[PDB]
Design a protein around this ligand. Structure first.
Ligand SMILES: Nc1ncnc2c1ncn2[C@@H]1O[C@H](COP(=O)(O)OP(=O)(O)CP(=O)(O)O)[C@@H](O)[C@H]1O
Ligand SMILES: CCCCCCCCCCCC[N+](C)(C)CCCS(=O)(=O)O
Ligand SMILES: [Mg+2]
Ligand code: NA
Ligand code: NA
Length: 350
């Protein structure tokens, strides 16, 4: 037999014998993740067992989509699929899906806690922007980028772990909401630079070591946004839905803190002239990403040209050919659970 079972992180992993010494490294709603040694390849890998992929159509749709995209995409800043397998032998018995990835060392939540110097921080941001540019070029707009779904090696190489939801989900997420853009929270729609707000929130957190816009719910989060950035313009509040517009127009008015007051010199390395230069450049980029109105917010392409980021720019990394996805209806079509199950099986069996 080609499989063995091991209990890891309170779940049963039934895996190919090539995968040895499984140890837990993380989990979330979509699966449980282990590090393992691959004996066929001679390297460590990460194995994710999908959690209840056929619990309902959302689970199945998201599993199928993550499988097709992870296979289709080939970019240094997006996690690659090394292998995928199921221990079950038929469509009728099919229950579990295991994804095998390159093994990274940490998620961004851990890295964010470090006193990051400007070389590391700019490099991490540069790589996130490269990954986002690549996803955008294929029509993948993430909308829920956050530190837990970005991973890093100890050499600061960075990969994004997932693709956010289908276009058809719009700005809806039916735990961690702090990185979602105003246009998402308020239901205004979105364009590509929706992901720039999330990069701004992560960058702001790397500086402050505090979540920028925390809170128990969207209501509390919106207060944190307007208290820090200021009440939005007439150009913007205009567009909100009846109950929302009214709530938003009726909140207390705030000038905003200036970016110097939001991210003071006190948070930045102070040694040298190089350090003073880099504090104002970091601030200036933050001031262009953390902009409530997406019409006034910097683009991914322009953020790559920013002096804080552009030092790293290499067109071989930035300007790679976009993924061509076969399924032009991928985000749209709905299926029964049974139908999704078969689509996923075929995908697993290649
Ligand atoms: N290839 C990998 N290398 C190292 N760690 C990984 C990894 N894949 C996942 N992880 C770790 O496992 C944790 C959760 O994994 P994963 O992101 O796939 O769960 P999830 O999709 O169920 C919810 P979320 O994406 O929001 O974290 C990560 O935050 C990270 O710490
Ligand atoms: C402070 C919290 C406020 C929560 C308010 C919820 C907002 C209500 C949703 C309005 C939907 C408007 N359309 C025009 C349908 C948006 C397009 C679809 S999508 O934006 O891409 O999802
Ligand atoms: Mg995920
Ligand atoms: Na990839
Ligand atoms: Na206000």
């Amino acid at each position: 037999n080609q499989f063995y079972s091991v209990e890891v992180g309170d779940s049963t992993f039934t895996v190919l014998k090539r995968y040895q010494n499984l140890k837990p490294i993380g989990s979330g709603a979509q699966g449980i993740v282990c590090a393992a040694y691959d004996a066929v390849l001679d390297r460590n890998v990460a194995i994710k067992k999908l959690s209840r992929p056929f619990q309902n159509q959302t689970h199945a749709k998201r599993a199928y989509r993550e499988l097709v995209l992870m296979k289709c995409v080939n970019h240094k800043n997006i996690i690659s699929l090394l292998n995928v397998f199921t221990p079950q032998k038929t469509l009728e018995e099919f229950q579990d899906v295991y994804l095998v990835m390159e093994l990274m060392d940490a998620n961004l939540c851990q890295v964010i806690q470090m006193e990051l110097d400007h070389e590391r921080m700019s490099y991490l941001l540069y790589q996130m922007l490269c990954g986002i540019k690549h996803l955008h070029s294929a029509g993948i707009i993430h909308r829920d980028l956050k530190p837990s779904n970005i991973v890093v090696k100890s050499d600061c190489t960075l990969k994004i772990l997932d693709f956010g939801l289908a276009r058809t989900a719009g700005t809806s997420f039916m735990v961690t909401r702090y990185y979602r853009a105003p246009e998402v929270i308020l239901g205004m729609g979105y364009k590509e630079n929706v992901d720039i707000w999330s990069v701004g929130c992560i960058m702001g957190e790397m500086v402050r070591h505090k979540i920028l816009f925390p809170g128990r719910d969207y209501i509390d989060q919106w207060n944190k946004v307007i208290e820090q950035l200021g009440t939005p313009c007439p150009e913007f509040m205009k567009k909100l839905q009846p109950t929302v517009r009214n709530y938003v127009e009726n909140r207390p008015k705030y000038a905003g803190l200036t970016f110097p007051k939001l991210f003071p010199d006190s948070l930045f390395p102070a040694d040298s002239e190089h350090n003073k230069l880099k504090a104002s450049q970091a601030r200036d980029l933050l001031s262009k990403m953390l902009v409530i109105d997406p019409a006034k917010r910097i683009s991914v392409d322009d953020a790559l040209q920013h002096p804080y980021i552009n030092v790293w720019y290499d067109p071989a990394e930035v300007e790679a050919p976009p993924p061509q996805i076969y399924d032009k209806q991928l985000d749209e079509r709905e299926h029964t659970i049974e139908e999704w199950k078969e689509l996923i099986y075929k995908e697993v069996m290649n």
